[PDB]
């Protein structure tokens, strides 16, 4: 309650948490601050209005905050937790986002500094920025359950939360992490064919996301399995079933598992190649 947060990052993530939070209620812009190295007009200069404090020195932050943010690259990281890691005192918690990069390497290398430090990987997206980015947590070696308390918590104020052993956030960050990019293709696509038929611009954009947001909340609210769902929708007669037919027969949900799996697998190498060198 008396915590205040900071993202030794920005860019995006960072925005995304940080705009979440803000219109969640819970922190307060200006108890926040993460560190600008550069400045990136849109997310620093963005930032710079909603009233969060940005500071040139990842350092400042550290100290402003009680729960820290690690929103950088996944090769950058190393070269911060080496730069901070002595600046880590034992109140605050490290929340780790950077994709695949592992619980164990970052405690390992940045214990070397703390006899037992607190730390969690994290998995997140974009849409966070509302109150339905899709988030994943895994508890680090030296990690209280009111840390993971926190967390759970913090985060299901901006979305959806759970615990998963961290394996298989390599796999979630495919599905979930991406995912919204897979939406946004999907959607100005359907835009495109949506004008593609008389539509104007911005009526088939909204109507095609309508269409999406509707078919989520059903497949959430529910069992069903899309399957059956995708059953209830489609007449014996067609337009819908026959819409699917040519999805069908151009690989539709093949291109989709592709998605994830090169997604997925992208994760893993970026991490199992900064293993070594």
Same mark, same amino acid.
């Given at each position: 309650?008396?915590?205040?947060?900071?993202?030794?990052?920005?860019?995006?993530?960072?925005?995304?948490?940080?705009?979440?939070?803000?219109?969640?209620?819970?922190?307060?812009?200006?108890?926040?601050?993460?560190?600008?190295?550069?400045?990136?007009?849109?997310? %620093?200069?963005?930032?710079?209005?909603?009233?969060?404090?940005?500071?040139?020195?990842?350092?400042?932050?550290?100290?402003?905050?009680?729960?820290?943010?690690?929103?950088?690259?996944?090769?950058?990281?190393?070269?911060?937790?080496?730069?901070?890691?002595?600046?880590?005192?034992?109140?605050?918690?490290?929340?780790?986002?950077?994709?695949?990069?592992?619980?164990?390497?970052?405690?390992?290398?940045?214990?070397?500094?703390?006899?037992?430090?607190?730390?969690?990987?994290?998995?997140?997206?974009?849409?966070? %920025?509302?109150?339905?980015?899709?988030?994943?947590?895994?508890?680090?070696?030296?990690?209280?359950?009111?840390?993971?308390?926190?967390?759970?918590?913090?985060?299901?104020?901006?979305?959806?939360?759970?615990?998963?052993?961290?394996?298989?956030?390599?796999?979630?960050?495919?599905?979930?992490?991406?995912?919204?990019?897979?939406?946004?293709?999907?959607?100005?696509?359907?835009?495109?064919?949506? %004008?593609?038929?008389?539509?104007?611009?911005?009526?088939?954009?909204?109507?095609?996301?309508?269409?999406?947001?509707?078919?989520?909340?059903?497949?959430?609210?529910?069992?069903?399995?899309?399957?059956?769902?995708?059953?209830?929708?489609?007449?014996?007669?067609?337009?819908?079933?026959?819409?699917?037919?040519?999805?069908?027969?151009?690989?539709?949900?093949?291109?989709?598992?592709?998605?994830?799996?090169?997604?997925?697998?992208?994760?893993?190498?970026?991490?199992?190649?900064?293993?070594?060198?």
């Amino acid at each position: 309650r008396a915590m205040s947060v900071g993202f030794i990052g920005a860019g995006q993530l960072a925005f995304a948490l940080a705009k979440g939070f803000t219109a969640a209620g819970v922190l307060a812009a200006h108890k926040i601050m993460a560190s600008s190295p550069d400045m990136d007009l849109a997310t %620093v200069s963005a930032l710079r209005k909603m009233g969060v404090k940005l500071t040139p020195h990842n350092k400042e932050t550290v100290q402003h905050s009680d729960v820290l943010f690690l929103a950088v690259k996944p090769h950058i990281i190393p070269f911060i937790l080496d730069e901070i890691g002595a600046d880590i005192e034992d109140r605050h918690i490290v929340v780790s986002c950077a994709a695949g990069v592992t619980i164990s390497s970052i405690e390992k290398k940045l214990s070397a500094f703390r006899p037992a430090p607190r730390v969690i990987r994290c998995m997140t997206n974009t849409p966070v %920025v509302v109150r339905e980015g899709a988030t994943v947590y895994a508890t680090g070696t030296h990690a209280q359950v009111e840390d993971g308390r926190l967390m759970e918590q913090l985060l299901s104020s901006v979305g959806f939360c759970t615990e998963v052993e961290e394996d298989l956030i390599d796999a979630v960050t495919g599905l979930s992490g991406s995912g919204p990019a897979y939406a946004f293709t999907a959607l100005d696509a359907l835009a495109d064919g949506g %004008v593609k038929m008389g539509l104007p611009r911005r009526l088939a954009v909204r109507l095609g996301a309508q269409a999406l947001l509707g078919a989520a909340k059903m497949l959430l609210h529910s069992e069903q399995h899309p399957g059956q769902l995708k059953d209830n929708v489609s007449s014996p007669g067609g337009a819908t079933i026959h819409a699917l037919h040519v999805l069908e027969s151009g690989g539709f949900r093949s291109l989709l598992i592709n998605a994830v799996e090169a997604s997925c697998i992208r994760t893993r190498e970026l991490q199992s190649m900064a293993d070594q060198e």
